[PDB]
Amino acid sequence: ARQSVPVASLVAEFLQEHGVDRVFGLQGGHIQPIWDQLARRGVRIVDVRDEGSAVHMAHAHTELTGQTAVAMVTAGPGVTNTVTAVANASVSRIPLLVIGGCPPIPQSNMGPLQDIPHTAILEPITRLARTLRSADQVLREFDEAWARASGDRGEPGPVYLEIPTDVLRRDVPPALQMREHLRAKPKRRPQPHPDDVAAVADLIRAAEKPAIISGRGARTTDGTDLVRLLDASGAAYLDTQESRGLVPDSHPAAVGSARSAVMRDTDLLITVGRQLDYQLGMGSPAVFPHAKVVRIADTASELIDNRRGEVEILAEPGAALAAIADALKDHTPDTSWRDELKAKHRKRAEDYRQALHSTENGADGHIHPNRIFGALDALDGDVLDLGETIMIADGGDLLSFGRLGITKARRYLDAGAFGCLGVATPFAIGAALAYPDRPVVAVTGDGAFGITATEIDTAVRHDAKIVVIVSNNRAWNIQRYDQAENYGLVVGTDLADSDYAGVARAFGAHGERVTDPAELEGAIRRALANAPALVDVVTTQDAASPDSGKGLGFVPDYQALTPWNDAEVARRQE
Amino acid sequence: RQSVPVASLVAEFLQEHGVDRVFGLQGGHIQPIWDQLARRGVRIVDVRDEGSAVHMAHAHTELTGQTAVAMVTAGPGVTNTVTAVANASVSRIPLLVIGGCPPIPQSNMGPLQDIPHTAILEPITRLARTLRSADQVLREFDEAWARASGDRGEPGPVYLEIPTDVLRRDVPPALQMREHLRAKPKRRPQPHPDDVAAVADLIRAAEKPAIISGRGARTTDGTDLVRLLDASGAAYLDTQESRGLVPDSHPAAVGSARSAVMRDTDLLITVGRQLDYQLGMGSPAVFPHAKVVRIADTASELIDNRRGEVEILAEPGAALAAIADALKDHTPDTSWRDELKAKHRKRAEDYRQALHSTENGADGHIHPNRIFGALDALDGDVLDLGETIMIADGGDLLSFGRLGITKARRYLDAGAFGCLGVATPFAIGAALAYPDRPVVAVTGDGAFGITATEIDTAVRHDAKIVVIVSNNRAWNIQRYDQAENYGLVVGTDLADSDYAGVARAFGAHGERVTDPAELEGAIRRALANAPALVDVVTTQDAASPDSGKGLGFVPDYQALTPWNDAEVARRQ
Amino acid sequence: RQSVPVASLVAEFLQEHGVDRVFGLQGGHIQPIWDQLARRGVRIVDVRDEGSAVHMAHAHTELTGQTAVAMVTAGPGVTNTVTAVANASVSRIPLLVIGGCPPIPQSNMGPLQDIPHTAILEPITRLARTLRSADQVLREFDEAWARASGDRGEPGPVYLEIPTDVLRRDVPPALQMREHLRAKPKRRPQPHPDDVAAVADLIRAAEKPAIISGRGARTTDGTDLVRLLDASGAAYLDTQESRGLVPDSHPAAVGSARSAVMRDTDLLITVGRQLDYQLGMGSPAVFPHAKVVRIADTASELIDNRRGEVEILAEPGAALAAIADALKDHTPDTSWRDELKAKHRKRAEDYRQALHSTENGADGHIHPNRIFGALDALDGDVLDLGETIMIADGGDLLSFGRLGITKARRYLDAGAFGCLGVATPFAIGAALAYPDRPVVAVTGDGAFGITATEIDTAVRHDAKIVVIVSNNRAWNIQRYDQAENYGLVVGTDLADSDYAGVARAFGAHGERVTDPAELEGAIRRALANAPALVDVVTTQDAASPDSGKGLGFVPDYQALTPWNDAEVARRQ
Ligand SMILES: CC(C)(O)C(=O)SCCNC(=O)CCNC(=O)[C@H](O)C(C)(C)COP(=O)(O)OP(=O)(O)OC[C@H]1O[C@@H](n2cnc3c(N)ncnc32)[C@H](O)[C@@H]1OP(=O)(O)O
Ligand SMILES: CC(C)(O)C(=O)SCCNC(=O)CCNC(=O)[C@H](O)C(C)(C)COP(=O)(O)OP(=O)(O)OC[C@H]1O[C@@H](n2cnc3c(N)ncnc32)[C@H](O)[C@@H]1OP(=O)(O)O
Ligand SMILES: CC(C)(O)C(=O)SCCNC(=O)CCNC(=O)[C@H](O)C(C)(C)COP(=O)(O)OP(=O)(O)OC[C@H]1O[C@@H](n2cnc3c(N)ncnc32)[C@H](O)[C@@H]1OP(=O)(O)O
Ligand SMILES: Cc1ncc(Cc2csc(CCOP(=O)(O)OP(=O)(O)O)c2C)c(N)n1
Ligand SMILES: Cc1ncc(Cc2csc(CCOP(=O)(O)OP(=O)(O)O)c2C)c(N)n1
Ligand SMILES: Cc1ncc(Cc2csc(CCOP(=O)(O)OP(=O)(O)O)c2C)c(N)n1
Ligand SMILES: [Mg+2]
Ligand SMILES: [Mg+2]
Ligand SMILES: [Mg+2]
Ligand SMILES: [Mg+2]
Ligand SMILES: [Mg+2]
């Protein structure tokens, strides 16, 4: 038998009933009424140093667990501190709820403390951004916003709700507190149409070099239906930064070191929960010169962008993949192309991984960042199980080296399609609190690190067992290198030889500096035994990542990378 | 003139408009402009977080009156500015943010960092545009610069972004017009004599006139304001945004009598000041006896919440001088002002003296007021507070700072927006603007963690700042609201962090203080070795004035409980 | 493929996507596209007011299921569409508006008609963009077309504009991709069997199940809906947007029992229908006994106001069929449905009979119900109402129309938006879509004055419409609220205008009727001579159902007084 209670109590209850067991945030007066109620219900409060980091932690939680996560921030600068992290979640299509404080209704437009247009600022990068002015309707609005965060009436992504403090304190009569709005809801499961399933299976049977490229929507599955389709199709398989870990490394389809060869030669590109954005050359005929196109997703955000499918399936991707696998029951696939790529991939990836253990110092006498990945690979099955480890990468050159150097991980997170520097520490904290049994390892550039370094404090106060490894090359180095190479003028891209280990120790974390690459395995072993911990690696400026070599820093007219841009320029003059 | 890329013409526009430094953080989308600024000899002050670059621009413009410039790359570079842009918008500070953005051919296709920057910033800018016509970029820059001053709006931040393909396009020489490149003077609208006369009539009829200053008054040197105070007999209050205009010894300057002035004035004259929550919305509940007059060069300081019986829209100096002239032959009645001044002398002097001996709290740690006591004791020894730029930031620390900082050439703080983390970026902007003297920033530990890594910026660019941290291991004004009013403290504690160690890790001088008697020495050594941080282990057992008045509770009608109580009584 | 201008490629995209007509009003900014459509043989239906062109597109898409297209020039051409765009957005109707806009070089310089079209339309469109990259225009068109269907949003209007310099730019052939030119099928997401089973379980447990249809059900042919009604024993209500799916004689069809069904159902099943104000917000105050199930192909008809114990997101036909199949072996309990059906037969038959003899009001003029009586009497004589598209518009006239129009192949009206003036533009779109039969639009005089000049469009394009005007010299539902509830009638009277004369002035057949016995003859002659208008001099002494229920008062919680009273009781 419900009673009359304040909006603030109902909001705390809505969240807990929807399966929220933690709220990331930073306290202010505008949200204290909710903050208090969450604590009294036993919801864990993870309080941070910068509200942006709380939204990064929510992001990591939802991406890893599939549970929509929640950040709570006060009016004015509390909300404006979230915009980068909200934009990043919007770009990556991650369900999350930001609850903001805002001034009481009587003072609207009168210059109360922190009256800025939060909803107008956030509308462009949210699925919903509202001020809730009717106490009796707050539960309803919460439940509808939660559904919109999952993608209802839009596509998956962040939502924003704010409740004027006078409304937070208003009582709601029990008759208006409806169980259907309080209760957790299951995810939607739209199913494929059998005609579209049949049509894709026909394209696969007629293709000689089918390739699957996965993304976000595939990563919401466990990968088993994806594997069933790979087996039934003979397709080669590429993942992206947002879809690592779905297919065993030894699978005959898994050809991660043959990215260019797959895109150049596939006659049937099958996207699974994946945008054809700049990360896949806009799906341009310039980059996929032979490919017919099929798109499978539970959101048209991964069906209609840049290329249209000969067939497009809007359905739960696991169901779609299983249905197509079933339709290929009596198909004997032609695997010769996939198998030739897999034979070459085995050698290229094994040679690359082996060479990580002995990469030479640069001309400045400092460690090559590849040695960090070499050291991690050497510790695998000794003091950590990389196969159970959540790996995070962030920075410029460091991030690009990380994409090749991180091959075994239960899960991978990074700067995202948005190129959001500073996610490493907040992501590692969200990851470690989600999965408390194993250290989380975040490898970051020094530039990226300076943005969220003070969250080391959060890791210590909340006991998040993270290991942060900093590639300390005294520079925004991928940028420094573009300046030097293409302008003959390096200016405002140098940083200093800062003591990041000392910063970590100043906030009560374990910290150590490494200048000798032979010390790396030991330093990372000690960091793992004493997490939360930072290893500050003095790295070379004389090292170009693959992203560096390919003009990422230059921003060409048509494509993110020079080679792809050159192919696009040729395509325009046919 | 020759044919040159948009990127060159932008660098030239800035330098010709008097820009000698740009704050920012490099990315590929803005490198073409970045390069051209460096080749022209414009100083690039590169930061650790783009938000801090916009804070630095803000401090430069507020102190110098010269519109300042931040430059950031596409996507997260622009989104990292939103708090600092909002803070400048709230404070009405002219500044230009130049963002990178993707090339035109890739619009809406998911290129790297294609988010709607202009839609995000439109609500908190005077202008937010994407510049797609190479030949018109110069024009757009000049018009945006005028709008940052308040043209077609009110003073505040503007945002311009140039797709990278447009940055690289040549402009023919005939389209590069001198009138858009050249620096422009500020506007100087003059008062109408009938409005001046009508204000002088109101002053002659008033027994207890009071002047409250703000942003617009602070754009003057104070001399015209002092002339009107002399001619009117008015009491004088400033606000956080208008400190240092009137000598402390002036018979009108009654800074410890804020409540008595608002309760009893029969003529409130606002000078370039909003009647926002900082002045009780100008409500009759807070000014129960006051007729109202408003003077400003922007209706943002004329129409908000209370209307003037007279409103003057003019350059405020000219308006103040004209009213002073019109009070030729008036003998002002100063008895109320003088009675407040006598009480003020006692109250302010006893308060400042007590700063040198404030007891430790019950937890055995330093009362933050001892930091202001130590700074007062060093005045005329190792620093001239009268020439010093002082910055305050935090919760309880900020409220204590408002009373403890009484001599400063200039004062900056969290602003009407309550923007925590401004201390370090403001101190850097201030120090590079005025390189002759250390700048002193006093901050809460909570606020400091937001922008602490900008200590690195201060060291790399040799900004002579001294940061003093009130390290009370807490968001303490919030922790205190929780404990007092909910009996539940949760998620407002921090730790006993080594902020001296953080500062030393970034190559700054650093010292920790636990004994209040060590403060003078530590501050002396910090001043001699700037950039420097003093980490003061402070008490949680200390309630600021803001704490005692319910700032943390957020009442229905007013920011503070006493004002809210008065508003509830007015409403029935 | 060859190199061709953007303007040609746009014309080709439209024709390939199945567009055989474009509604609009010519201007210089869109002439390049206008010309190319005509050269390709796409019919141009030019109108008197751009709003009407978008109304015509709306009616075309709602009736045919083919996305329709309006094209308007820059500035006032685009701003004239805003009501019709809002109406399509509220009703969730796919349509494309193509606006002109100024060339890129002149952006922000005050060129002719540079207003922010995309900012004005963003809040009421699924997409609103300015297309600045010639090679990407085709792609943008195809993606916008998909978003109009509901992709990345929900069904509704999209807006695209192309600066005139871009319209004139060539696209190389390699960039003209077949996949963007070609027509696309509608999406067909399928139900999950566990959700289908869980709905069938709820139906088996229910004693008084009721199905209420809307937009999404009306995109089907009704056969799957009738299968579920047969298998479930459910009562059936439609709404204005879902008429004609279930034969009137079906044992479930209880259209005169709306209140009894909502009061007593223990299982409300919405089929492609919002629980907006038209269904009492789905409030427990209006459905006090109902569990809720929601079925739709868009969460716009699943999450609003009430959540389902089950929600099915799927093509509604497939969902209905699957649930019918799952009710294999169920014997439904029809006693409640049958008791409503027996009462419905009497009430609806007595009501329809009474339409032929309704008395004149106290002012001696025709009761508008006689118009529906006359149409009923001509059925099977000079027109087949069962094949006729019927349109209603106005205040009291619209409410009388909801009861008086019982046979129509299809029905359109003012919509949930209450958009007065749709009658004539809807009738024109309907008539050009279905050229074999006259379309009959019944309208208030108030509503008609908004779009009356589109009679000219009907004549110039030979749309066989018959417009019947309820000429009560008033905005009468409003005049009646004023008189009853304020004792002051002011600014709601119109005059005894000659609407027949207006119609004849634009070359249409026209007749005025003052004697109710003349209605059958006048409507016969109008049908034989379409396009035609019948101007009926109607009473002000006639309260519609909407009038009696306080629609005009706007209560706090619900659109109607009785529902509002029930909501107030629920709230205490
Ligand atoms: C513009 C600026 C600088 O101001 C910014 O803001 S940048 C923002 C921060 N940076 C980012 O967010 C990065 C954005 N860029 C990208 O995400 C990528 O450049 C891309 C998605 C556009 C392209 O990535 P790739 O498709 O090239 O994928 P990678 O995983 O990086 O693969 C690189 C190469 O290594 C190869 N490879 C991968 N795993 C390997 C393995 N295990 N062993 C050996 N080789 C391996 C791979 O095949 C490929 O070689 P190739 O076939 O093209 O020759
Ligand atoms: C809501 C939350 C907590 O989540 C937030 O986000 S808060 C954001 C962070 N904080 C802020 O941004 C501050 C916001 N508040 C304010 O700016 C102020 O509370 C106020 C402007 C609204 C009110 O300030 P006052 O008018 O009280 O001004 P102060 O300079 O603080 O003076 C306080 C008292 O000390 C007095 N005083 C000033 N200088 C003195 C002196 N030198 N010696 C002695 N007394 C002195 C002054 O007269 C007054 O006493 P009284 O007259 O009312 O009795
Ligand atoms: C693009 C499209 C078609 O789709 C649209 O939407 S157009 C929208 C509807 N039309 C408009 O709103 C008109 C917009 N255009 C204009 O306003 C004008 O074209 C203009 C302002 C841009 C240019 O006007 P002018 O400066 O040429 O001024 P007018 O008063 O029209 O003068 C025309 C000529 O007559 C002359 N003139 C004026 N008064 C006269 C007099 N009394 N006797 C003799 N000659 C006279 C005048 O000097 C001038 O000749 P000249 O010196 O250029 O040779
Ligand atoms: C918030 C923001 N501002 C700028 C940029 C632009 C950028 C992308 S990569 C990069 C250099 C990163 O340096 P780091 O030290 O982390 O890595 P390394 O190259 O190994 O030295 C910058 C400045 C982005 N994406 N985000
Ligand atoms: C970005 C932002 N997030 C939250 C808040 C809300 C707030 C206002 S005051 C306060 C406490 C500040 O603690 P600090 O340690 O600096 O000061 P002290 O009381 O002396 O211990 C908070 C959290 C604001 N204004 N801005
Ligand atoms: C564009 C617009 N402006 C006002 C209104 C408000 C309204 C709703 S009903 C009504 C009266 C309609 O008078 P009409 O003469 O057509 O009907 P009748 O009652 O039979 O005499 C008005 C003015 C609406 N909905 N739309
Ligand atoms: Mg930030
Ligand atoms: Mg939005
Ligand atoms: Mg670096
Ligand atoms: Mg503190
Ligand atoms: Mg009427």
Numbering used by the authors:
A (entry chain A): 15 to 588
B (entry chain B), C (entry chain B): 16 to 587
Sentences from the paper on this structure:
To study the underlying reason for the deviating Km values, we have determined the crystal structures of the enzyme mutants E493Q and E493A in the presence of the substrate 2-HIB-CoA and inactive cofactor dzThDP to 1.76 Å and 1.63 Å resolution, respectively. With rmsd values of about 0.1 Å, the overall structures and the substrate-binding modes are identical in the mutants and the WT enzyme. As expected, the conformation of the Q493 residue of the mutant is almost identical to the one of WT E493 and interacts likewise with Q41. A closer inspection revealed that substrate binding is suboptimal in the WT and the E493Q mutant, since one methyl group of the 2-HIB residue binds very close to the side chain of E493 (2.9 Å). Accordingly, the 50-fold reduction in the cleavage rate found for the E493Q enzyme mutant can be partially explained by the low acidity of the amide compared with the E493 γ carboxylic group. Therefore, alternative proton transfer routes might be present, possibly, through poorly coordinated water molecules.
Actinobacterial 2-hydroxyacyl-CoA lyase reversibly catalyzes the thiamine diphosphate-dependent cleavage of 2-hydroxyisobutyryl-CoA to formyl-CoA and acetone. pmc2-Hydroxyacyl-CoA lyase (HACL) enzymes belong to the thiamine diphosphate (ThDP)-dependent decarboxylase superfamily and catalyze the reversible cleavage of 2-hydroxyacyl-CoA thioesters to the corresponding carbonyl compound and formyl-CoA.
